[PDB]
């Protein structure tokens, strides 16, 4: 973060720090705290883990006079696959979004095994705009999220009420879910997909729906891009 601060603020370039194993960093904090006579906190980690993680995370951000930015991808390692753990809890408190890697997706050979239902970026509306990206980005993402949730619901519903009894909006949603997980989320480790190419793939996935079904997309964008 000192290197990032230097480059971004005294050089006017964008950084995107990618920290790795902040769980390992918290373990190091535990070791350092117990080197002194500090009594362990909630889960053995020090009571000032909130302060330490806050410093490390909020070292980033844009500034006024300088034309440079620092972005952070802390990349935690949830110990028991739970969010109630102090490291994920505090990281969610300080940070400004979540990207979830799912064991269910990983066990199906889907790379990257990111599930978009628990994952969100609170600052997405600013990044995905018209001058930035392409003007359909936000509506396309919202439609993809809604239809992916409907796909999960229909996948659970099929084994309960049979495939035939599902509505058209459930059968087409199952097809969308299959194509979405196996072609959109499933990305080659060395495949570079620009935002425009990814949005084109997203539109290709959405096009299986007739224009009347895509309701979260604005009418103008729907009429222009479909």
């Amino acid at each position: 973060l000192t290197t990032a601060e230097y480059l971004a603020y005294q050089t006017e370039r964008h950084v995107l720090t990618i920290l790795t194993d902040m769980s390992s960093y918290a373990d190091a904090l535990r070791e350092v705290s117990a080197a002194r006579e500090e009594v362990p906190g909630r889960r053995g980690y020090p009571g000032y883990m909130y302060t330490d993680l806050s410093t490390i995370y909020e070292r980033a951000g844009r500034v006024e006079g300088r034309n440079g930015s620092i972005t952070q991808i802390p990349i935690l390692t949830m110990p028991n696959d739970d969010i109630t753990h102090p490291i994920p809890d505090l990281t969610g408190y300080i940070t400004e979004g979540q990207i979830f890697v799912d064991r269910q997706l990983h066990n199906k050979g889907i790379y990257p095994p990111i599930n978009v239902l628990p994952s969100l970026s609170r600052l997405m509306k600013s990044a995905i705009g018209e001058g930035m990206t392409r003007k359909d980005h936000g509506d396309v993402s919202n439609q993809l999220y809604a239809k992916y949730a409907i796909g999960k619901d229909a996948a659970a519903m099929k084994a309960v009420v049979g495939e035939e009894a599902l509505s058209i909006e459930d059968k087409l949603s199952l097809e969308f879910l299959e194509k979405f997980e196996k072609t959109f989320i499933t990305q080659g480790a060395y495949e570079d997909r620009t935002v425009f190419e990814s949005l084109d793939q997203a539109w290709s996935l959405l096009r299986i729906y007739p224009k009347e079904m895509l309701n979260r997309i604005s009418p103008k964008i729907l009429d222009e891009f479909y």
Partner: protein, 51 residues
């Protein structure tokens, strides 16, 4: 189907009465006598509606 049953049973009763009047006697006794075997049978089918 209840309405259809009502109309169908009405017309079947009318047809049976007409047949009995044409024959001049009640064919119920003859039908009961010729009841050795049933030409109509129903086989259960496990239709899977919803779950």
């Amino acid at each position: 189907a209840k309405q259809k049953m009502g109309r169908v049973m009405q017309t079947a009763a009318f047809s049976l009465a007409e047949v009995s009047y044409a024959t001049g006697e009640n064919i119920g006794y003859q039908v009961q006598e010729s009841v050795s075997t049933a030409r109509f049978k129903v086989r259960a089918r496990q239709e899977n509606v919803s779950g």
